[PDB]
Design a protein around this ligand. Structure first.
Ligand SMILES: O=C(O)[C@@H]1C[C@@H](O)CN1
Length: 789
């Protein structure tokens, strides 16, 4: 019986979870062929498009057994392509990723030999990663190696965008027509940018040709496979696939079935064009599918079950696409196979009214049934959302596998407008990746890396010296033993923050240039608003909205650490700075008195305690002020968001003991959640604390909450969950997502992981299999506060 409402979706789901994660070298081979043929003869954008077209023209293509939506990134499910133009793996990288315990990728010997003999000799010098690393300053390299921040674009393309509605209203033949109209009207006399516009537009036209080739090829393959298929029912499925691919992606979808296939084709495209962060997502899928759903049921070619079956197929298709292999710091900061394909169900419709429709509930049923950690199927809750939809979402959340996450539609809309989006565009918006607010289909909102806010406090406390790397990573802001007031230390901290943010942004500017010049994405550009009209690649600012983020990690840890110092060193004067640093250097060994004071007798973030929460506000504002408004190379601005993925593990690992009681090498806090052991007053206290962070001034904040399974039972639990979401959202909280697990199931899962392969927990903005997480990350989740109502 298992999972899947129909036989078909049961089978596709079973194939999905059994697919072995491996690398598919075919993309690298084909991209090398295209470069050796075209490199040096065309501009880089056209070169990218021609390579993508050459790849789409010659890649093998698979229709899995029983599929209705067709298309895989790699050779087979969980087959990750490689991206040697971004990161050309060394042979040791292939070794590490093949043999690592968690998030491994099998490197077949055929892939290994090809990479060593065909890929490395060509791409070792061309990969953008070396371009980036060789262009970085010494202080950047030291800070990067010291774990002060991470670099999102060392192994992945900026990506991090969401489909809008263009692909349902237009085909790629239509988009090629729009691009050809832009080309005809380019003014090379007066528009001094016309050359760059032409190169980008010409590239987008090729991407449209490539998307059209993709549909022709799949329809031909489907018909061809129908000719040898002896099963009439499967033959008809293949004929339906062919009929679907005759329409999409060349023409706009006319049916609900075609709308989904159009999305997934675009998904495959943009996600093999570049190893883009957060893969891709349809965004407001229920908004886009509903007119197709109503039009199809009225016409009698679709019913609620066929609608659900198709969406369950789409769910499996997401689950077949791992985030391509990461190594080094990129693995540490994103230690997961998931690619954060974040779907927003519910929210408001384009006119700003309640968006919950029939497809909204179909989607809820699909995520419930499929229980797949991809896509990241979440709900947007508006003050206009009918309680039935919120309560139904809680029915799924309380089942304890993390999804759905809850996003505050009104927060999203206001954040977008705060970043400069029109209300018209904001109403099309939502969250992607973990919690990242974006105007879907109209924005490049690029994450550039995690910022180790607690370690900046550490540098502050060591006069710029990093006691872990034993290098002078920061600047000399003074011996804190000489600071006579908390304010002075916090000023010293802001100075360290300014220095570190300066190093990060400086590298980002170099990196943003490298991605703009060396990673143009003509395919993505065809569907993202304003790119065609501007004649400007998405990668150099063609989106209507352009934001860059540095994601702040460890706000809880650093808040409590600064609170511990304000309370104990300056306020109550239980000990002085010199003692605290001695305690920190000793990992609190021999300072049990101090460790207890800062852990249990000092105000803590997440209890509606203004003493600690105002410190959180000062730190968050210091971060917001330090980053927000900085220009991006391509005419946008930096903004701030708070979200860690797995980087709160790494950031804790390369950090020493912190003034809040956190021990050396221990994780820093995740998202904007309280520090480990910090919230002792229940969830209402934490959502009130978290609401004091100005979510509207961010591009998203991540709140993890965990509930004891007993308190979410029945209608009382649903109502309590629904009220907590609404109470947090009524205060403009941005996001809340729930763990509902039995601590003993996870403890046993650690002891016998082979018995709990099913076990999914919520990490940070996503759900993952518990066994894919390091022991440190597992214990971090376990250490999260079990809340009761
Ligand atoms: O894998 C990650 O780290 C991406 C980055 C943010 O979109 C959240 N998820």
């Amino acid at each position: 019986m298992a999972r899947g409402t129909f036989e078909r979706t049961k089978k596709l789901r079973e194939e999905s979870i059994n697919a072995e994660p491996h690398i598919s070298i075919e993309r690298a081979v084909l991209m090398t062929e295209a470069y050796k043929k075209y490199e040096g003869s065309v501009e880089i954008p056209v070169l990218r498009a021609l390579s993508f077209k050459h790849y789409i023209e010659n890649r093998t293509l698979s229709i899995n057994d029983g599929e209705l939506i067709v298309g895989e990134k790699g050779d087979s499910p969980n087959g990750a392509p490689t991206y040697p133009e971004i990161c050309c793996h060394t042979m040791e990288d292939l070794e590490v990723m093949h043999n690592r315990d968690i998030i491994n990728f099998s490197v077949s010997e055929e892939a290994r030999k090809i990479h060593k003999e065909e890929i490395i000799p060509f791409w070792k010098k061309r990969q953008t990663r070396d371009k980036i690393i060789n262009a970085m300053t010494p202080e950047w390299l030291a800070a990067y190696e010291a774990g002060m921040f991470t670099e999102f674009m060392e192994q992945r393309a900026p990506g991090h965008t969401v489909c809008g509605d263009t692909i349902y209203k237009k085909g790629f033949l239509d988009l090629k027509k729009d691009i050809e109209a832009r080309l005809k009207e380019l003014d090379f006399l007066n528009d001094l940018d016309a050359y760059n516009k032409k190169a980008d537009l010409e590239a987008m036209a090729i991407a449209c040709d490539a998307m059209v080739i993709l549909g022709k090829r799949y329809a031909e393959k489907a018909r061809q496979m129908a000719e040898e298929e002896t099963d009439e029912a499967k033959k008809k499925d293949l004929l339906l696939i062919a009929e679907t691919c005759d329409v999409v992606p060349a023409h706009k979808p006319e049916t609900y079935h075609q709308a989904i296939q159009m999305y997934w084709f675009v998904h495959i495209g943009v996600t093999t064009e570049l190893n883009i962060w957060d893969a891709f997502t349809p965004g407001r899928l229920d908004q886009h599918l509903n007119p197709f759903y109503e039009r199809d049921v009225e016409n009698g070619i679709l019913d609620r079950d066929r609608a659900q079956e198709l969406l369950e197929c789409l769910w499996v298709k997401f689950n077949n696409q791992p985030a391509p292999p990461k190594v080094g710091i990129t693995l540490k900061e994103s230690s997961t196979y998931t690619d954060f394909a974040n779907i927003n169900t519910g929210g408001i419709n384009p006119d700003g009214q309640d968006g919950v429709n029939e497809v909204s509930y179909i989607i809820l049923d699909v995520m419930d049934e499929m229980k797949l950690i991809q896509p990241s199927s979440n709900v947007q809750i508006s003050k206009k959302t009918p309680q039935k939809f919120l309560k139904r979402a809680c029915e799924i959340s309380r089942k304890g596998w993390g999804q759905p996450a809850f996003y505050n539609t009104e927060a999203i809309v206001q954040e977008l407008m705060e970043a400069g989006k029109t209300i018209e565009d904001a109403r099309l918006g939502g969250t992607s990746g973990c919690v990242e607010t974006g105007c879907f289909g109209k924005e490049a909102y690029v994450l550039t890396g995690y910022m180790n806010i607690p370690k900046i406090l550490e540098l502050t406390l060591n006069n710029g010296y990093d006691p872990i790397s034993k290098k002078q990573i920061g600047i000399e802001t003074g011996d804190p033993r000489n600071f006579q007031s908390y304010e002075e230390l916090f000023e010293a901290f802001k100075k360290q923050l300014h220095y570190m943010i300066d190093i990060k942004i400086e590298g980002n500017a170099v990196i943003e240039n490298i991605c703009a010049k060396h990673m143009p994405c003509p395919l993505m550009s065809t569907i993202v608003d304003d790119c065609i009209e501007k004649g400007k690649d998405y990668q150099r600012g063609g989106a209507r909205y352009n934001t860059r983020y540095i994601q702040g990690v460890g706000i809880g840890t650093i808040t409590d650490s600064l609170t511990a110092i304000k309370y104990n060193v300056f306020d109550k004067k239980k000990f002085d700075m010199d003692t605290l640093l001695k305690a920190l250097d000793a990992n609190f060994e021999g300072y049990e008195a101090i460790l207890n004071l800062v852990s249990n007798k000092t105000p803590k973030y997440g209890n509606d305690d203004d003493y600690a929460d105002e410190i959180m506000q000062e730190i968050f504002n210091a971060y917001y002020n330090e980053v927000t408004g900085r220009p991006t190379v391509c005419g946008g601005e930096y903004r701030v968001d708070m979200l860690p993925t797995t980087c709160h593990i790494y950031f804790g690992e390369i950090m020493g003991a912190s003034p809040n009681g956190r021990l050396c090498a221990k994780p820093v806090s995740e998202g904007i959640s309280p520090e480990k052991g910090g919230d002792t007053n229940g969830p209402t206290a934490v959502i009130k604390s978290c609401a004091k962070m100005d979510h509207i001034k961010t591009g998203g904040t991540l709140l993890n909450q965990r509930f004891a399974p007993s308190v979410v039972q029945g209608e009382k639990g649903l109502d309590n969950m629904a009220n907590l979401v609404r109470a947090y959202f009524n205060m403009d909280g941005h996001h809340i997502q729930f763990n509902v697990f039995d601590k003993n199931v996870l403890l046993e899962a650690q002891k016998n992981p082979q018995d709990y392969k099913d076990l999914i927990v919520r990490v940070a903005g996503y759900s993952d299999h518990f066994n894919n997480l390091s022991r440190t990350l597992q214990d971090e989740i376990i250490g999260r506060t079990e809340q009761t109502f």
